[PDB]
Amino acid sequence: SFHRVDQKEITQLSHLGQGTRTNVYEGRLRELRVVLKVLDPSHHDIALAFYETASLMSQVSHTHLAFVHGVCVRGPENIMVTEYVEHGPLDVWLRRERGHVPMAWKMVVAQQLASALSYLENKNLVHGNVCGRNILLARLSPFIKLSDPGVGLGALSREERVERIPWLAPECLPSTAMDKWGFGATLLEICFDGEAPLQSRSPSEKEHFYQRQHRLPEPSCPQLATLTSQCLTYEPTQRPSFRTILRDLTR
Amino acid sequence: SFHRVDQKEITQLSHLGQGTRTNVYEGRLRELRVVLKVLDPSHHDIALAFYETASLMSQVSHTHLAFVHGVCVRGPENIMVTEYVEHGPLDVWLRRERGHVPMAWKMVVAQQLASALSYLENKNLVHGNVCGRNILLARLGLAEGTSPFIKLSDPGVGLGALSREERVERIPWLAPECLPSTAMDKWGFGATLLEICFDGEAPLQSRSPSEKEHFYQRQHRLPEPSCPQLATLTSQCLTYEPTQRPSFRTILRDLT
Numbered sequence: 394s395f396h397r398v399d400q401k402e403i404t405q406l407s408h409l410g411q412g413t414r415t416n417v418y419e420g421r422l423r424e425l426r427v428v429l430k431v432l433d434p435s436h437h438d439i440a441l442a443f444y445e446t447a448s449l450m451s452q453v454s455h456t457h458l459a460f461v462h463g464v465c466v467r468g469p470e471n472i473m474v475t476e477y478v479e480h481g482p483l484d485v486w487l488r489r490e491r492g493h494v495p496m497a498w499k500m501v502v503a504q505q506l507a508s509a510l511s512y513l514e515n516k517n518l519v520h521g522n523v524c525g526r527n528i529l530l531a532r533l534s535p536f537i538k539l540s541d542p543g544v545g546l547g548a549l550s551r552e553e554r555v556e557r558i559p560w561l562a563p564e565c566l567p568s569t570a571m572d573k574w575g576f577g578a579t580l581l582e583i584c585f586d587g588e589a590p591l592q593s594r595s596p597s598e599k600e601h602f603y604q605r606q607h608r609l610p611e612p613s614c615p616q617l618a619t620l621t622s623q624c625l626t627y628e629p630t631q632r633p634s635f636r637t638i639l640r641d642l643t644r
Numbered sequence: 645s646f647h648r649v650d651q652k653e654i655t656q657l658s659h660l661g662q663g664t665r666t667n668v669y670e671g672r673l674r675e676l677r678v679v680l681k682v683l684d685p686s687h688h689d690i691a692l693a694f695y696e697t698a699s700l701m702s703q704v705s706h707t708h709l710a711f712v713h714g715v716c717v718r719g720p721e722n723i724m725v726t727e728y729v730e731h732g733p734l735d736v737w738l739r740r741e742r743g744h745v746p747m748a749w750k751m752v753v754a755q756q757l758a759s760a761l762s763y764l765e766n767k768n769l770v771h772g773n774v775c776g777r778n779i780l781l782a783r784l785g786l787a788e789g790t791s792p793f794i795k796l797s798d799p800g801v802g803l804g805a806l807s808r809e810e811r812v813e814r815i816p817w818l819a820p821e822c823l824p825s826t827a828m829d830k831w832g833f834g835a836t837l838l839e840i841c842f843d844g845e846a847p848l849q850s851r852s853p854s855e856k857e858h859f860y861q862r863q864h865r866l867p868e869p870s871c872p873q874l875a876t877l878t879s880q881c882l883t884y885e886p887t888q889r890p891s892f893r894t895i896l897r898d899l900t
């Protein structure tokens with residue numbers, strides 16, 4: 394399971410942003426700089442999907458996976474106490490640095506992300522929310538940590554799942570295979586300097602794109618074109634394993 | 645000398661704060677993020693002291709010294725175009741984080757500052773305005789396995805061009821011999837160490853100009869820092885006799 398944190402051990406500081414049904418803050422854990430993921434007032438099935446994320450992340454240990462200190466229950470709020478990463482989300486940094494991010498830097502990120510996902514695949518564990526926003530920069534060569542997936546994908550509404558297109562695996566709209574799709578969509582996002590395909594488009598348009606099984610663009614980066622195309626296949630069984638992806642990233 | 649920047653190359657944005665006879669803004673250099681230090685409408689001796697700072701900064705290169713892109717003349721305003729440092733002034737950060745700044749973090753800052761000042765000392769160059777406000781944070785060093793990373797800002801309008809009233813406002817950072825040499829920077833460094841140790845709460849800073857001046861006139865000494873690893877260092881730096889102050893070579897060696 395996960396460690397229980399008393400509210401006396403933590404101090405809530407600046408607001409960093411928002412997640413699905415959460416508010417993200419900087420904080421202190423009694424001293425360590427932490428990140429506090431404050432769950433909105435929620436029903437037991439939502440809080441349970443949040444505890445399951447805490448449980449999963451507490452039972453894993455990988456260099457490219459962010460640490461989870463535990464969970465604090467503060468009135469109607471569930472707080473996941475997590476590792477603070479220096480430079481924050483990758484997507485934000487790619488947009489600020491657009492047109493000035495070298496291809497070699499992007500390959501380092503891809504390799505490190507595939508390493509974290511290969512580790513989870515071998516343990517038959519699913520992340521379910523691979524995207525640039527969940528990729529944290531510990532070092533700007535770069536060093537990443539994949540964040541916890543927040544509230545589990547299984548507990549969200551159709552509307553929330555449509556909002557996650559193109560990162561959301563198509564089989565999830567109506568298995569470790571979903572993370573191959575998430576990984577492929579993240580590679581496109583990285584290649585396009587944080588500008589993911591379909592992100593501006595309406596929910597109806599995003600859903601229609603998946604319903605007709607239209608395919609996402611080929612990345613402008615040629616070394617990742619075959620990889621993304623193989624990952625972004627509608628047939629989950631047709632997606633390469635992370636062992637294969639990781640092996641193909643060394644060459 | 646320094647690079648001349650045309651006004652067509654720059655964009656002025658948010659106000660960051662004020663310096664001695666300046667207004668500090670975020671801006672853009674054609675599009676690079678920069679800091680623009682806008683000199684007030686001034687006398688030629690003040691513009692000259694500002695050009696000398698730009699000249700000095702343009703001829704130096706060190707990892708813990710902030711970069712100066714050049715100067716723009718627009719038109720009764722002189723604009724120094726400088727490097728933008730992510731987290732800004734150290735003194736502001738120390739006050740926000742008061743009581744939560746570890747000693748090991750403070751020692752890193754001290755070594756990086758002494759490294760920048762040792763480089764200037766070897767080149768016989770004087771900064772003249774070492775204080776927490778001129779120490780900029782490029783990296784915070786809050787995460788485990790990470791260290792702070794500082795950039796010492798340009799000294800702005802030169803100390804020699806300011807009024808006695810402006811020099812009294814600079815106590816306790818201002819070297820006492822400057823009230824009526826590279827030695828002044830050893831005093832500035834010592835006063836900055838006290839400020840860092842006291843989480844951005846420098847001694848005498850609340851006190852009146854009369855009190856501050858009297859403190860120097862009577863040659864009263866500044867307090868010993870609450871941090872024991874820097875007590876001997878600060879006491880040696882904060883000596884009224886400029887020749888009695890240790891060299892940055894000695895200070896830097898003693899900090900390792």
Ligand SMILES: CNC(=O)c1nnc(NC(=O)C2CC2)cc1Nc1cccc(-c2ccc(C(=O)N(C)C)nn2)c1OC
Nearest residue numbers: 409410411412413459475476477478479480481526527540
């Ligand atoms: C384990 N630690 C962390 O996650 C973390 N660590 N360090 C930092 N540091 C800084 O920001 C440094 C710069 C000060 C930040 C971090 N988290 C973080 C910050 C802001 C928003 C989200 C967010 C956003 C969206 C979602 C979500 O629902 N989707 C579907 C993506 N979820 N969360 C977030 O999580 C990814």
Ligand SMILES: CNC(=O)c1nnc(NC(=O)C2CC2)cc1Nc1cccc(-c2ccc(C(=O)N(C)C)nn2)c1OC
Nearest residue numbers: 660661662663664668679710726727728729731732777797
């Ligand atoms: C080389 N680059 C810079 O100086 C600089 N870079 N990045 C940032 N970033 C942020 O603020 C990030 C956080 C948004 C800020 C910067 N500096 C800056 C900002 C505001 C006021 C002063 C100031 C104040 C006082 C004096 C002065 O008179 N004395 C006597 C010391 N002088 N200047 C200042 O200069 C030290």
